[PDB]
């Protein structure tokens, strides 16, 4: 405890993600919407907009 501020312990958690190539398994609170087709709409398919 008498050491300096540069020699203190530091708990580190590294959250490493991988980009979506497999079918998506993990993500959070976005409400799903009933699918409508044959119309110029905005979509959100697994995190991509268009």
């Amino acid at each position: 405890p008498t050491y300096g501020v540069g020699h203190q312990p530091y708990r580190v958690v590294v959250l490493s993600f991988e980009l979506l190539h497999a079918p998506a398994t993990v993500c959070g609170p976005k409400k799903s919407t009933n699918l409508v087709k044959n119309k110029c709409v905005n979509f959100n398919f697994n995190g991509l907009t268009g």
């Binding site: 050491y3 300096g4 501020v5 540069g6 020699h7």
Partner: protein, 99 residues
């Protein structure tokens, strides 16, 4: 106002033992990356040391204006060295005052 200048030359420079001597956070440099000191090599190394307050730390940087930068210690336009700073509240303070 009276910073000391020490010339370092004609020796093998190991920059990985710098972290053990003083408990600082990061090895802030401008013209060189902090990662790649050991493989390259230079001509001369100069050392300057002084004790400041915590507000006027960003004034020691190339192209700054203040009180330390204007009347006490000014860095050039193209600085290719490194600047290191760490807290010293345990060895540099008295209840009456450090005059």
């Amino acid at each position: 106002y009276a910073w000391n200048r020490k010339r370092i030359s004609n020796c093998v420079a190991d920059y990985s033992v710098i972290y053990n001597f003083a408990p600082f956070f990061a090895f802030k440099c401008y013209g060189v990356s902090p990662t790649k000191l050991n493989d390259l090599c230079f001509t001369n190394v100069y050392a300057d040391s002084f004790v400041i307050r915590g507000n006027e730390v960003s004034q020691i940087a190339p192209g700054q204006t203040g009180n330390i930068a204007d009347y006490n210690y000014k860095l050039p336009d193209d600085f290719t060295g490194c600047v290191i700073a760490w807290n010293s509240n345990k060895l540099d303070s008295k209840p009456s005052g450090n005059y």
